[PDB]
Design a protein around this ligand. Structure first.
Ligand SMILES: O=C(NCCc1nnc(-c2ccc3[nH]cnc3c2)[nH]1)c1cc(-c2ccc(F)cc2)cc(O)c1O
Ligand SMILES: [Cl-]
Ligand SMILES: [Cl-]
Ligand SMILES: [Mg+2]
Length: 213
């Protein structure tokens, strides 16, 4: 089996069905004690929580589900009726994410889409009936943060006040994205310094609030 399968099994055997907090704690324990994995982690996850609670978004898009850690973390704080769409290119990870969400009891709040963000983003309006997004969490291939931001704008998916929250702006880093948003009058940016998941290595999140064209 793969590391992602091992994380899923660990959750199923060490968390309580229907209890998202227990799911997060199980993943963080496994990744601290057994095998590192690229989940956002508890340090950065607490910053994410604080953001989600501030904005109470009704429709969130996540680019890069992986095993569903951040999807569980965000979806557990959404208000009744609010929804998360998450895009994952790797089909094995998409399946693990769906099972993770099912275990956590969050499947009715989240839609996990298996595919490349650049192909799925242009379908969101017509196929998935999206008007505009309240929040976007960027956590996919670091090279894709900037092109996919520009694509979201082109497709009319951003509105005044849409919150972009980007993981890994230090490690591995996303230098073109970061330079772009920090230099653009269309975004108001804030940097949240933190640590790489499960490591004593500095990392951070960037929040970039869209201001319109
Ligand atoms: O590469 C990362 N994350 C991205 C996974 C991905 N790779 N493929 C996708 C996708 C999902 C839909 C997509 N749609 C279009 N492209 C897509 C790509 N997602 C990543 C890496 C690290 C990391 C840090 C230090 C190290 F020493 C090694 C690694 C930490 C993190 O927190 C990460 O998030
Ligand atoms: Cl994650
Ligand atoms: Cl952590
Ligand atoms: Mg990440």
């Amino acid at each position: 089996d793969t590391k992602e399968q091992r994380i899923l099994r660990y959750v199923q055997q060490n968390a309580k069905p229907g209890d998202p907090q227990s799911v997060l704690e199980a993943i963080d324990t496994y990744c601290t004690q057994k095998e590192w994995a690229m989940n956002v982690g508890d340090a950065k996850g607490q910053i994410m929580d604080a953001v989600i609670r501030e904005y109470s978004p009704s429709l969130v898009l996540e680019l890069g589900a992986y095993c569903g850690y951040s999807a569980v973390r965000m979806a557990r704080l959404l208000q009744p009726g609010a929804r998360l769409l998450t895009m994952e290119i790797n089909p094995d990870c998409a399946a693990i994410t769906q099972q993770m969400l099912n275990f956590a009891g969050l499947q009715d709040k989240v839609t996990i889409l298996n595919g490349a963000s650049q192909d799925l983003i242009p379908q969101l309006k017509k196929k998935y009936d999206v008007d505009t997004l309240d929040m976007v969490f960027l956590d996919h291939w670091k090279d894709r943060y900037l092109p996919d931001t520009l694509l979201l704008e082109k497709c009319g998916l951003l509105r005044k006040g849409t919150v972009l929250l980007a993981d890994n702006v230090i490690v591995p880093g996303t230098p073109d994205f970061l330079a772009y948003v920090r230099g653009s009058s269309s975004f108001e940016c804030t940097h949240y310094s933190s640590y790489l998941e499960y490591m004593k290595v500095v990392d951070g999140l960037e929040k970039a609030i869209y201001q319109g064209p």
